Amino acid sequence: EVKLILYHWTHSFSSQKVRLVIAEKALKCEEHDVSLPLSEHNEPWFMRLNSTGEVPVLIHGENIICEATQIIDYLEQTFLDERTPRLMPDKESMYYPWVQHYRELLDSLPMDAYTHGCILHPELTVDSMIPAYATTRIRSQILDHDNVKYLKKILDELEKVLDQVETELQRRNEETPEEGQQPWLCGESFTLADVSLAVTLHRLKFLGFARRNWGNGKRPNLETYYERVLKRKTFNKVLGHVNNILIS
Amino acid sequence: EVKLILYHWTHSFSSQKVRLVIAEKALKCEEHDVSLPLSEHNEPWFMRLNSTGEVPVLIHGENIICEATQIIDYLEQTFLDERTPRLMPDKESMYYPWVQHYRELLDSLPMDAYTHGCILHPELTVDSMIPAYATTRIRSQILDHDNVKYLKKILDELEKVLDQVETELQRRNEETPEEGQQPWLCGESFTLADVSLAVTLHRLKFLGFARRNWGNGKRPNLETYYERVLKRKTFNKVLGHVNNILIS
């Protein structure tokens, strides 16, 4: 039969979203982790995050797509079996603009900039999971140069995106009955915007910028969202150990 | 050992150049032809040329590149063994500007536009190898719309690129002794610009625009170049039967 194939770096933002979509849609893929346990210079996966995560690539028989966003879209378009769950509304529906908006909003964030801003400029992190011995190595080894001003700017922009999200989630909470199917950001169905939000929050925690953005009575609906998605079966299967620096 | 892998459409301009580079550099790859012998609608490979040729993808252990030009560059950069022949001059050399210039010159051509301009607007072709039954199917089935003016414009631009090439080849002929190692476009070494020129000319013949551009005393040095490269072992191994509509 025509088989799905994927070549990816397990510890990569792109691959994380793609694999989560493959699991949400119940699709069976032949995932191949191409990442090395240790680099030529014996850099673990966390010290290697600076290195490009290598955009993933899907091979569906004859078709070939190589980009997280594109591969995700292709999976949605090609697998239309009634059993396969859909992670997007119908184009005609009045949901699609909102869903796509928030997906883009969260996909526009410069995660690559953050990942380098915690290794560097580590004072802006809180409870970062990246070993500090990587900071010194990167700082001395020497992409955009290190400007605390720049890093502080994009993090203030991250606050804006997450503030919008927090508002929408609060609206969801007000609408839903206490005892009832709790909805996600856009609706009761797990959308593509939810896979972006979920992976974003998870990576942010690895960087330590999570505590600053939500917690201790800040963005409470966002805090609840994160604890909820951490328990989801799909999340713990794909992204479960992706933040553990020991497992690699 | 770290192995090379490639997923490609045998009858695709991109894959043709890449596979030719892999052969010129003597590298061993695990090429996988993903193209189908016949489509879902039973369209042979030539009637399927309209369909995107699917950019190829190289997987070198941990590294992943998915674009003809990029994959070619990567192969040049990563395989630096003395045995591996180099298809480019040294960056410092005064050759590199010229070589890269002609490579870009020939890579800028809109081959995708030509491939659709011969199926459509077939009067501009001469001895086209595409069965004419594909023309009628495409013309009625209905990317940029069909304007004879547009097609005639880009073909006049193709004449300019090939006229430059013809001039450079004439200079090569004047420099070289009759009895001596005949040089290619840029020098005695087979460059990346030569793989572009070679595959370009070969595809053009499949489209029928070859006769118009060279032949019968027109661009004689270019005609000689084409007959010469057709005999090259690397060419007949990779691109040998890529223009034969029977072999598929």
Numbering used by the authors:
A (entry chain A), B (entry chain A): 23 to 164, 197 to 302
Lines from the paper:
Charcot–Marie–Tooth disease (CMT) is the most common inherited peripheral polyneuropathy in humans, and its different subtypes are linked to mutations in dozens of different genes. Mutations in ganglioside‐induced differentiation‐associated protein 1 (GDAP1) cause two types of CMT, demyelinating CMT4A and axonal CMT2K. The GDAP1‐linked CMT genotypes are mainly missense point mutations.
Here, we describe the biochemical and structural properties of the Finnish founding CMT2K mutation H123R and CMT2K‐linked R120W, both of which are autosomal dominant mutations. Using GDAP1 variant crystal structures, we identify a side‐chain interaction network between helices ⍺3, ⍺6, and ⍺7, which is affected by CMT mutations, as well as a hinge in the long helix ⍺6, which is linked to structural flexibility.
